[PDB]
From Swiss-Prot, chain D:
GO terms for molecular function: antioxidant activity; identical protein binding; peroxiredoxin activity; thioredoxin peroxidase activity. This is Peroxiredoxin. HAMAP family: Peroxiredoxin. The active site is a conserved redox-active cysteine residue, the peroxidatic cysteine (C(P)), which makes the nucleophilic attack on the peroxide substrate. The peroxide oxidizes the C(P)-SH to cysteine sulfenic acid (C(P)-SOH), which then reacts with another cysteine residue, the resolving cysteine (C(R)), to form a disulfide bridge. The disulfide is subsequently reduced by an appropriate electron donor to complete the catalytic cycle. GO terms for biological process: cell redox homeostasis; cellular response to hydrogen peroxide; hydrogen peroxide catabolic process.
Length: 238, 238, 238, 239, 238, 238, 238, 238
């Protein structure tokens, strides 16, 4: 009963440790994308490593106009305590709201519901539309640099009217090139081939390179960060 | 209407360009994991770049015990023609089966169905259990290296009885450390804290470094490959 | 959809911070009464005062053959952290289990369930039968001594085969007297009056004083404790 | 299928031995609370004891602005004879109504109900007609009526002062007769509280002060003291 | 939804002030008829008169082998108090059981149910068969000697194999005569009319006078008693 | 599904040997009561004896403002032949209508219905409300003088605002006394005991003698007449 | 809702003024045809004229092995009175039974059922099969000699294996001839035509004259009787 | 579900071999009665003899104002060759329409429907009301002079306001007489008796002879034709 890609985020009122809000309206109203991310329970190690990782990438998400909101199946009092614990033992403050979903209404509405099954990432755009969902299970932490690549790429897609190849900006076939959406009629395929404006492998596989140098590099940065062993662990001085 | 993570893969007979087969059974009987990935239709570019990316990493999936299987809503005859085109135009041979799903029976059965919504990666273990799902939209290519990180961390987790923190093996808090599953009783938590046998931040956040440097370095190789600019694009050398 | 007094405690399996148990079986197969008490959420102040008051009366229940089990709509990880907080800050160990009931499954099943409606005390005897149920609002703490007085009285009425007057052992009409359950036939009602064996107000109001001086003193002890201001508040030396 | 705490008391027109009345309306209209209490049947000894016990605390109930209303599964004519019997044989006048529920309609509506033994249940309902507490003692166990007085005093104080009330109040082990500030539910609300410096505190979510007048506190403590004390002079002797 | 004449009296257990009994069984087992008579409520004046009326005629009923049983919407306790008061203030002991029907289950079952509508007399024969029902409203007391007349005429009918004319034993046409059930065939009718064993007005209207002078004087006694103003009223000698 | 005492008599059209009529309206229109009395079939002996009994008392009914109406399961043609036979052979003329109910539609609407079951007297007041029902089985003739007593008694309690005791006007407790309906409040009962206006046994048992001596003696003549052995049987007279 | 030609007569127990019988078995047992004819009510003049016409044709019906049975919506008692009347006033005894169908159960079951629609004649053969049905309205009496012609012609048909032309034995084309039932196949038609064994208008229209001269004149005799002005009206001789 | 007597003929549009007409409107519009007669199939001999007898009487029906209409389960094209064969081989033109009812749509609507069951005669009056229905089986030809007797009697009953005795105009009781519809109240019964305006056997059996001598002989003429052996058969003039 999980929403589909391309569907508006189910209309709902939710309670967070920052107050009551309506989703997706609260983000739509501010012209924001949001990433809603779900966890089975407070005071859990894997999820704690994700909150901290999202927290460290907070400016990267604001820079793209993206808000973060968590969801956990525990009361608003535990959420506050858990957050306090993180800032106190880890030294990292968690600035995003957490939905307090005891009773599991929000999870059930979202099709995530056990509780072990309450995982799940919704990437939602500024029009309220679910654009991507990832469901890593509770024993596997998210790779948060990929979420950042995803919204950065969806945003370049929307703005440049382009589809994005596997492993962009390091596609093995066309590199950092972006794909021109394919023709759907024969006159359109013909006009595109006579047009001679795009690099081509077939009438259904034209591309160009319209992303700017910074955008491409912003997107390699995310992946370099995923790829490098950190200098300095936080357990060292915590 | 998707299968939830944690559930068996739905029992089904399917027709592929390699022959007729039962899922999950055909991979279970081989003690093999499989990554099942879907596509809206043949002779589409974002999908082609994905097949090609999967095909290039194919020995990396063999090494891990993972068989690859495609799904497109188009006939066996299209699938074979689509493949030959890839071999002929890009010089990469696609070695894995694709399910011929015209009519969308398999897709509807998996909750994916439109056709634009026909996307999705099921990562399924050798007992035929769904361990992770990823839904990227048709306009965004998959990051195939993160599929590799995912199965490798998950097989790692299984054989070590450990959870895996965000961004592993480059987690900001514990690096390449792996998480001991949190105690669920008071006695069990007492005893953990008396044992002094793990590095600890609280009774619910213990860890250690039980993975071999082969394991850690193989998982970082994938993220690294993901982050590197290719030397020699396939469209040039095609 | 709550149980009625006089019915079996619903058959169910439940997770507590001491582990999985079957209710009412786990207590029944021991010859123990148990009191199950419910709470909206962890780290809430009224409920904490209740845990403490229960904890302070622990031996009193043991001596009456009564076990205490709590219920809160939060995860076992929260339970255990809330517990440690109490012992650390108030300096009382909470010796009893608390049902981890996120999703509110147990509460729904007992008709308690929004979330604040999760309050309520069940007093279940050693045959599994709900004997008494109290429903205090979350903004009002229970009178724990009244709970002791209920089981003492019930155990007495049960063993001696008598009903127990309002305010017993201090009833304004008959004091520490216990009522003979009234006759339901006219034969019986005449036999009882010609027998001249009870003090009497009418064939339907007959009583005697069958309880020992030790049982009566025990029950006044509960009520005196409820009545007196404690010398030494726990908040100071904390 | 009981009503739930926090739910409005079910609209119903009932017949009592003082006449026909609409609930919660009759009481709400006067800005009064009521305590509704329930009974399997007339001329039963356990119920007669609670009736008398309520009668004796009847002025304590009026000082708190609370009306008392009984329910029993018998006709009005029995309710009246029962009352006359109590007044005659025990020498205590029963001044509150008792709803006549022959046939069980009201009892079924409140979900109390060859049962009837199950017709018990005390609904403490406030002046906005909202159910605030319910208690289910079995037929074989009289209610501690002083504890009902305690609950209404405590609940009226919590409301007027905007406080939660601790276990065993006014004799809580941790904070005695202090009253709890409703906990904060946001991050800023929680920091702000702990910045004000203005409550005694054990954590952001456990704060309290002592705003109940000393008459409030001592009034709630007599209830308990009375409950605990041996009566000088029983009523059956006197008769 | 009342059982009809000729139908078996509904099987059921009821609680009386004489104890629990089974109907119609308890009476059938003994070869006794019964007269169930119902009332809206205890300590009501019409019913009180009717009870006293039945009690005074209790021997008459015993001599016909008819037990009596009352039904009222009030408790066993109330019933017993109502009976003591009748005995104390009217000086008449009420010797038969009254069904305690709190909740009105029994009355609901016999179609009597509000509560005013709980009126109604069932005349039940030794075979468990409802033979006559009368419905006086609560403001009108029954005429109890017509019930004696009723069972006495039915017992004579049963046993003489006869139907009983209006007003018997004082019918205007045939007096104390009794009706032969009419033939239902042309052969039966011809044969009868040739038998000349009966007095006759037509083939469908034959009778004789087979009841004893005792049986006829007994029935007349009940009507005479109905018609006579009692010398001495019970309110007087009270 | 027989109507209840207290309900407005079911609205209907029926056909009788005097023509078509609307019930209850035809009688409400004239401020008249009516007595409807049912019978299995025409040319039956017990029923004939009852038609005749009603016919000799017809003036008594007129005198009370009560009309009479039969119902029998047979056609209008048989009704009329049956009435002619009665007047010709018994020499008594039947003045009142009989409903033709072939099909048994009217009996069915009234719950009477086989056909042996088609017995039943409804006494319906002038506002169309069913006041009393009797169901004598088809082998026992009614006592028509009791039907007269009942309507005289009901009319007197209506006009005087009183209830009528058992056996009135020969009640054993209070003779021709009539009952003041019991008070329903503690207040109303206190005021009434105070007032000194009624003779009294308890607050719920109050009475006076407000019926005129004429009305008393009129009600007693019905019963006297039922008790009298007739001079002159009609079978001989014929 | 009426059964149709060729169906077994509905199985049923019915009460007649001759006693209780089972249809059709009662006639099947005797190898007898029956004619059942219905009437809306007793003491009605058209049906009286029909009963008299049947009665007069009784010996004629019996010689064909036809029993007669009536049905009227009235009681057995009315039926017997009605018949008494016919023999007394007309001088004709009615020998066949008549079903007492008060309530109209039997007629509703036959689809006849107002009551004015309770008309209709069923001709039922000795196997219990409805062979013919006639629905004359209440105001139009049957031509009973046509019923005699139908069962006669039907019986010759069955036994001679032969269809009967319109107006038999006076058909305008073939007179007293009978039709050989048509061949239903090409072969069977050629064969019938090659054999020259039948008079013939076409292969579908073959006929012979196999009926006896007594059989033909018996059928003409019923029609001669239908045509003839009676000598002696029965009301004159009445 | 066949329609019953006195119901309006079902409203419907039918195709015949004279064109598309609406029933019963086509005939109501002319103020004509119609006789509708059904046949299982074309080219069948009993039906052909019935057509021929209808066409011979066609002017007899016209003088009564009766139209004829046939029904058969075959096509217009087959009906037309059937009529042609009848004219050609029998020397008789068939003048009336035959409804082409292939599929058996009209037969089903009318309750006739196997296929052999499609048989049946509806006599329908100038108001479109069904007055008589006749159901002869496939192997038994209708007696058409009896259909004339029926309409003539029926049209006479309507005009003279009289019921028609059995066998009219040769009824054994009252001969050519017609019956006055019976009185249905006791007043009309007596009024009729005392008025002396009718010959009479009892109040319900009153008759006169209003039929004109020409009506009577017309009706006997039909019956005389039905009884006369034809000299000259139509098969021998072929």
């Amino acid at each position: 009963s999980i929403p589909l890609i391309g569907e508006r985020f189910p209309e709902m009122e939710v309670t967070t440790d920052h107050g009551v809000i309506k989703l997706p309206d609260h983000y739509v109203s501010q012209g924001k994308w949001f990433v809603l991310f779900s966890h089975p329970a407070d005071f859990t190690p894997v999820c704690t490593t994700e909150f901290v990782s999202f927290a460290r990438r907070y400016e990267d998400f604001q820079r793209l106009g993206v808000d973060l909101i968590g969801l956990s199946v525990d009361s608003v009092f535990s959420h506050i305590k858990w957050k306090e614990w993180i800032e106190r033992h880890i030294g990292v403050r968690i600035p995003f709201p957490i939905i307090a979903d005891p009773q599991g209404t929000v999870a059930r509405r979202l099709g995530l519901l056990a509780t072990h099954t309450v995982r799940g990432v919704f990437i939602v755009d500024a029009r309220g539309v679910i654009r991507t969902m990832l469901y890593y299970p509770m024993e596997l932490g998210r790779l948060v640099d990929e979420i950042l690549r995803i919204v950065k790429a969806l945003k370049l897609g929307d703005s440049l009217k382009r589809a994005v190849p596997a492993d962009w900006p390091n596609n093995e076939i066309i590199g950092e090139g972006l794909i021109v959406p394919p023709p759907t009629t024969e006159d359109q395929a013909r006009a595109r081939m006579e047009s001679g404006q795009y690099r081509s492998l077939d009438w259904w596989f034209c591309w160009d390179t319209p992303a700017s140098r910074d955008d491409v590099e912003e997107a390699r940065r995310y992946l370099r960060r995923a790829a490098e062993k950190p200098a300095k662990l936080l357990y060292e001085e915590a």
